[PDB]
């Protein structure tokens with residue numbers, strides 16, 4: 001069910017974009033602090049892709065709005081859901097939306 005609470009927005013296709021997660025009845029973004037291919041691989045597999053192609057820092061697919069829900073995401077890279085990775089307290093970040101994280105998943 002966790003796959004319903006993550007999404008990729010404003011990419012060239014559904015395989016890529018700004019990462020947004022659903023928490024407390026709202027979509028919010030993910031800070032790029034410590035954002036790396038281990039975290040991206042977890043996101044990509046959650047969404048049904050084979051894995052991560054590349055991750056991007058500094059709002060590569062534009063700034064989100066609203067809450068920044070996750071910061072300092074520290075996935076090992078093999079988790080079945082990003083919500084079992086280590087990360088910040090929900091909504092507690094030292095980030096702005098200029099730091100919103102993104103991913104391109106291996107698909108094409």
Ligand SMILES: *[C@@H]1O[C@H](CO)[C@@H](O)[C@H](O)[C@H]1NC(C)=O
Nearest residue numbers: 009010011012060061062063
């Ligand atoms: C979407 O991403 C592009 C870069 O590919 C960015 O320039 C643009 O701001 C983003 N779109 C939004 C919603 O602004």
Ligand SMILES: [Ca+2]
Nearest residue numbers: 032033034099
């Ligand atoms: Ca940063």
Ligand SMILES: [Ca+2]
Nearest residue numbers: 033071072094
């Ligand atoms: Ca941080």
Ligand SMILES: [Ca+2]
Nearest residue numbers: 034036073074
């Ligand atoms: Ca990380």
